[PDB]
Subunit: 460 residues, 4 copies
């Protein structure tokens, strides 16, 4: 077996030990293996996967394979692979093209190695994506392959936005499931995963004390909620920025001061608009938005000396790292940790005090500087992925006549009953005991004893 | 002026001082007063109101009046009135029939005094309700009045469930707005209000140390989330019960142990099914469900001696207080605080150690033993109420032709843009500064710079 | 029986019900009753007591009486009495002179009624004091009575400071025990009691939401630690001031921003030295120092409109309330809650926005606006009081010859073994289980299996 | 230069970059460098140092050298060295013998290389120790060297206990300073350091989600306080064991349930005495005691399958790892992470579910699996070390006449004024501003405006 490319195949046994531990931390996903292994619901599925090649993703891949699938895999970020996980998957005879510290050229080459087998398009019929890069390449470069693909299952709110833009423009070629919008994904992974992993990554990269220091979290959606908690629970003094007044209300009620980098919140592009007094007191800035240029050049210029700058949104463009590359000298401390010297670009002084510390070159910091979300949290997201793969594969969209395809071409979420079933396995993993409604109580609130327990409008 | 009934009109000046302070804590609601006072959008409205006669409700009532309405008011709970608030409203020449410590007969009489003026139905044309009791009485006993009513604005998730049952059965006679499902209601009031007011009520009633003691919170919806936090932040060791596995998942991730009162969660009605070991260690039980008999007779029998029992859901039927009335002796400590002696019903021993402490006779504890939610939280709920009253009044359902009425007979929520506008005023009240999107950023995420900022599916 | 003065003797039965509950919350104190009742170690003791006449103090008084003492009692603060507690004690035939809302003249008259019985000095032979006022009156006005007194047991760090000044000057006439410096007093009561009771008092007085608002806590000793936690756990954004860099270090590490009201910390008496920007953002100031004028006139002038001002240190002079009385108009909201109108002193405008809310007229806010510390915390302080009374009474200093008195005239703390025994009863009250050392383990760390477990230098 | 032994000298540049960052996080220690560099107070000092060879210790070493000292260094634990720190120190021409993953034989050899230079005793005249191993070797094996040594500065509460045993027995040969008992050491490092670094180490070793899982912390001294917080802030459900009722009282008040591994707390050595129900629910056990066999063989047998076991006390003997070595098979996952298979000793099944995960082979977990305490915390401990070295070096005990030596042979602490001065530099590092007392306020509380601010009895 040679149809793979990883950093170091001798890391496989270490990865396999970590996969075995992870399986014990992932009861929803393992439960699906056990439930469906007889049936082989993914027999004949040929899945192109593009998602962070971590130990958690290894358990996902091996679940899909245990259910009958074949796969070809790549990472969706240049710094997120755990090389022992990639090695263990390759050593199992699964095609994977992923290593920590890819260049952009290598990143694109890895996705292409999944798409092509022996120099020609693979017989793919399903896509599992995280962020939409693989989806975009297939639509732009490999439309013939999409003719034979039954569906896309997309992990991220960023990627879903990209799918919805395509649907609106009539350019989406295959149906999709929005995995993000399961409650056991968005209100588990996006929030509690970042709670676990943000402070982890900052400690691993810097070993800085966080207690007593000042942080600014840009955004207060699910990731910004989790991130703010990650830092506050360590004793940081956390301030929060938002454009959405409802999320800002939540931040206030949650005990944070809501501030803007700009005077009166007005971002008009001048240095004069920056709240220099505010930014000059910040020790750590974290972007969480999924938006562009939310930690901009003028903000970077105004930050307190020796501040840490990082991004936990999907794509690096949240921070103006291009400005920093053009203007300032980068001193690498160790992989994924750079001092950015604001003195200029013509070399640097190792003892200069006027620098910022950038983590993961602005790429997702939890995966870049640590190991991303823990297995017991990714259990929820990845159980949803498996259920979504099963649903779209069984629907067989590619084999439908044109008129029937037109009725099915949509971006949908999984039903609440399945979200509940995933949650129950997670709860049992903690040793939790859910109460069963009596028939009188189920009648009283208007639900089945089996669920679903909430209307689709419920926000949790 | 004599068209009122309150405990003590001499409390009015104290109430008025507290209304003036509350106005300073309610910027959304005060902002609506300022914005709409010229236009008089509620000129000609005649509103029957049934909601807890607190200081916060006084600010609501006076906003409605300032916008042009006439009202006739009662409380929706026998213990929730603040007598100084009722007095201040009556002293202002507004019909109010409410006092703390009503009997059930008096409660019904008060609602009837709003409905009848001078012994005949008042020419009401709007309803503001909290829990659905007024709505039910109008449908059952005064259906002719509904022929002239343009709509109902309902505060509570309980009352909305009741309205949806009526709609489904074809018995709802006028359209309604579900105020609860604004984010600035459900994810503000239900959660943060109970966070503020649950520990407040327990301290006022008992003066018990909470730190280091064991609590069981039944339910983990919005009220159970806020309640659990109210107790955990004081240092309680909190366990959480749930029937909904998604809510139970949240509780686990939030750092609580998820337990059932019943062995393996099976509530089969025998004493043998009670987890006596668990209940024998609990110092405080709080019900949050909106369901029936979630703290049942067998649970009450198994609780640790001297445990506190209370309910923060809308109706008292969450706890089997009828069982306690039939079997055990009640020693009143002070109003809304009773020791329930498990020794029997034939008198009590003042020094008996085998008792429970019941707060507010099992009625909503925050309002019964304290003052309910604080003004700055109720600002959100009550701004929504005013917007909802304006919308339904302006739509004039009662005046529509039959075919037009058929198209508008619905239970609806307010638009997200208005939810956002309420939130923004709340945030400004904390001194928060919301950032404005640049045109490029608004394009990038697919929103208007003015909002709304999220799709209707977003859960916050 | 007529040898008492209370607000309303008909409150006795309510007080007695609350005493019975409190006994169930005070296992250390009740354990001393049970242990020593046979022996009657306080038979012949005649105790002048001056400490907050709360339910908790009632349990203390009745323990002393159960052990053989007779007492005459007063409160040590004009606003701290719970009138039902005072009534219950009077109804039991115990001389008590205390009510909530005394004037200064009445306060002094009440202490004098304890000292004098039937117009002549009582046959006192012990003193229990909280803050040193009774101790001072005896030394200045009744030195003949001190000849027959065996000792003073003093609750407070303020009062201990006053005792140590007297000892140093050679004016202390009888020995004392510093009850404060038991760990089960200072590191229980001073910290966790204020954690429980500060937010309680502010809610009762104002009903303000605390979450999301800005607080300044002046001091970070035991009370400032507890107070800061009381507010932070509610979601306040808390800043801390200190003069002691070690306590300030603790505040930083605990996750607070450490600030001064004065520019660069320099308090030189001018308006120019005030950090107006800082004070203009503060919603709540709490003094915790035991020092003088730590919330001074210039600070008061600079506070944000509608800020709440309160003091939880023993004496009101922490806040310059005299300045406010001389310059600004006081609008009483309700007892212990005043709006202080910064517009001037010539009447007030009920709708003026430029006011501060002062709680308890600057007197200890927890006792003034709520009920002070909870029974389960006061159990520790008051068990120490009883042990201290027993020790000094048994030593019989007054009966010693002059040369022997000279050897015993000291201010001392209780031995660690007794502090440990109190703590063990508290722990058992929570259902806690302490592990017993094996003989090998006790040898390994150099302690007895029975304790004491730490050297006297240990700080906990 | 060849007088060193490290893992990899090519790591030096990386170490030096991390030292430069650490200097920016250590203002107290850097401030001492600046203050004393002119004076060279350690000119002629020849310091044998034995303390964890981390980046933080590198800043300490280079401060000592900057003040005039020569040193010879080793680590005090086999797993605590950061190889890049050791390399940087060796590359600077400083003798260091330390690497991560020493054997016990290598550990002893490294200490011997500090003691011997060119095969003969070095002319050492000062000792800096952490845990007492170097001190013991000098007293037992090299007593002639102690004739020329002016003093020992000891980091740890374990090592101080060892010094006090020697003093009591008349076997201590040179005076010592107890560095641990500075408040800026014990109530900074022991508490907040473990708060930072315990959860860090567990995440690095296992990548386990902690939220929602059950932990047992054995001990509630400074390390157990910080450790419990490290876990609770992540959402663990933490129970605490203690032998000291005062520490157990604190745990209850801090919101933890206090439990014993043994039924009724009685550790009589039989399996029957183990509370199997309790231990069978524990996911993580952490020992913090400084005692022996506090996680014993019978406890290990009863723990829930797949529990994590670790120790953060100074020595590994807290956990019965010898029992595990004799009876159970060890599967290495990666360095400092072993699965201990309870199935037996004859090989292991890679898929066995009945194992425990042991971190750092039971040695101090924060240093073994992460990087120990962060620089900004170690600044306090290490500033104290430098002050202590200066004091004892300047006192010149070895040169004193016999009668003079007898008066100075003691174990002492640094003065409070110096503790305060360290704290002040720490506070300024956070941007904190300490208030200066006015003359009137200093008089009122009986202190100098310059401090010290508290009596020596104050516990903070
Ligand atoms: N690193 C991880 O493991 C991880 C985990 C989950 C999600 N994500 C990624 O994080 C991003 C955010 O995801 P989410 O679920 O929080 O989305 P979300 O929509 O819940 O929240 C994003 C928030 O950013 C706010 N925002 C937008 N522009 C802003 C600006 N200029 N200033 C301040 N606030 C602004 C929005 O109002 C919104 O509330 C996405 O790219 C998502 O894919 C990363
Ligand atoms: N006292 C107050 O001020 C206040 C504030 C807001 C809402 N409320 C009332 O509180 C109630 C709950 O409101 P909410 O917004 O939390 O509703 P919700 O639907 O968000 O939550 C109720 C929860 O109870 C759970 N539940 C139902 N039966 C259960 C059982 N037998 N055991 C355990 N859990 C069970 C459900 O699964 C659900 O998650 C309603 O009656 C509402 O009107 C009171
Ligand atoms: N209300 C209550 O129930 C209650 C409970 C316990 C103690 N107390 C009282 O509270 C007071 C404080 O007691 P404590 O045990 O915290 O004493 P403490 O000595 O532990 O702490 C007082 C703190 O105030 C600081 N301080 C002094 N002057 C200051 C200034 N100008 N600015 C800022 N900080 C300053 C000191 O450095 C010290 O750390 C005493 O009067 C005590 O009797 C009240
Ligand atoms: N890993 C680190 O970085 C680090 C940091 C500081 C201290 N330490 C070490 O940690 C240890 C503890 O230090 P500390 O400052 O907390 O000491 P401490 O004396 O403050 O606390 C130890 C606690 O253990 C308790 N204890 C003793 N035997 C027990 C038993 N059988 N069961 C339960 N509790 C028991 C004691 O009562 C005491 O309260 C020492 O070995 C110290 O050197 C390690
Ligand atoms: N202070 C207060 N005034 C009026 N309504 C309140 C209140 N506190 C809680 N409520 C409302 O009471 C509802 C339940 O009947 C939930 C909440 O909207
Ligand atoms: Cl996402
Ligand atoms: Cl509701
Ligand atoms: Cl005190
Ligand atoms: Cl130590
Ligand atoms: K991970
Ligand atoms: K209220
Ligand atoms: K009390
Ligand atoms: K470190």
């Amino acid at each position: 077996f040679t149809d793979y490319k990883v950093a170091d195949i001798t890391l496989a046994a270490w990865g396999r030990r970590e996969l075995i531990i992870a399986e014990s931390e992932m009861p929803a996903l393992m439960g699906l293996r056990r439930k469906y292994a007889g049936q082989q619901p993914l027999k004949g599925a040929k899945i192109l996967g593009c998602i962070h090649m971590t130990i958690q993703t290894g358990v996902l891949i091996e679940t899909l394979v245990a259910l009958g699938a074949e796969v070809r895999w790549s990472s969706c970020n240049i710094f997120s692979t755990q090389d022992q996980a990639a090695a263990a998957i390759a050593a199992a005879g699964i095609p994977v093209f992923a290593w920590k510290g890819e260049t952009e050229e290598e990143y694109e080459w890895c996705i292409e190695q999944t798409i092509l087998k022996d120099g020609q398009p693979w017989d793919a019929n399903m896509v599992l994506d995280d962020g939409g890069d693989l989806t975009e390449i297939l639509h732009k470069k490999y439309p013939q392959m999409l003719e034979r693909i039954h569906g896309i299952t997309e992990e991220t709110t960023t990627g879903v936005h990209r799918l919805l833009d395509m649907l609106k423009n009539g350019t989406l070629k295959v149906p999709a499931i929005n995995v993000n919008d399961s409650v056991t994904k968005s209100k588990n992974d996006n929030k509690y995963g970042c709670r676990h992993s943000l402070n982890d990554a900052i400690k691993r990269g810097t070993d800085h004390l966080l207690s007593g220091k000042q942080a600014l979290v840009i955004g207060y959606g699910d990731v910004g909620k989790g991130s703010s908690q990650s830092l506050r629970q360590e004793g940081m003094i956390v301030k929060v920025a938002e454009v959405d007044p409802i999320c800002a209300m939540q931040a206030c009620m949650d005990g944070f001061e809501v501030v803007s980098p700009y005077k009166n919140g007005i971002n008009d592009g001048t240095e004069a608009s920056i709240d220099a007094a505010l930014l000059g007191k910040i020790d750590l800035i974290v972007t969480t938005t999924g938006n562009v240029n939310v930690c901009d050049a003028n903000m970077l210029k105004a930050l307190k000396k020796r501040a840490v700058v990082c991004n936990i949104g999907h794509f690096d463009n949240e921070i103006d790292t291009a400005f920093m590359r053009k203007n300032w000298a980068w001193e690498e401390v160790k992989p994924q940790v750079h001092k950015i010297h604001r003195t200029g670009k013509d070399g640097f002084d190792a003892h200069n005090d006027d620098y910022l510390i950038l983590l993961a070159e602005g790429r997702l910091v939890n995966l870049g500087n640590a190991t991303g979300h823990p297995s017991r949290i990714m259990d929820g997201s990845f159980a949803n992925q498996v259920l979504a793969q099963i649903h779209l594969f069984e629907q067989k969209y590619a084999d439908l006549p044109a008129a029937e395809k037109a009725k099915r071409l949509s971006v949908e979420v999984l039903p609440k009953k399945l979200d509940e079933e995933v949650a129950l396995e997670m709860v049992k993993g903690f040793g939790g005991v859910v109460t069963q409604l009596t028939p009188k109580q189920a009648e009283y609130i208007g639900v089945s004893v089996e669920g679903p327990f909430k209307p689709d409008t419920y926000r949790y």
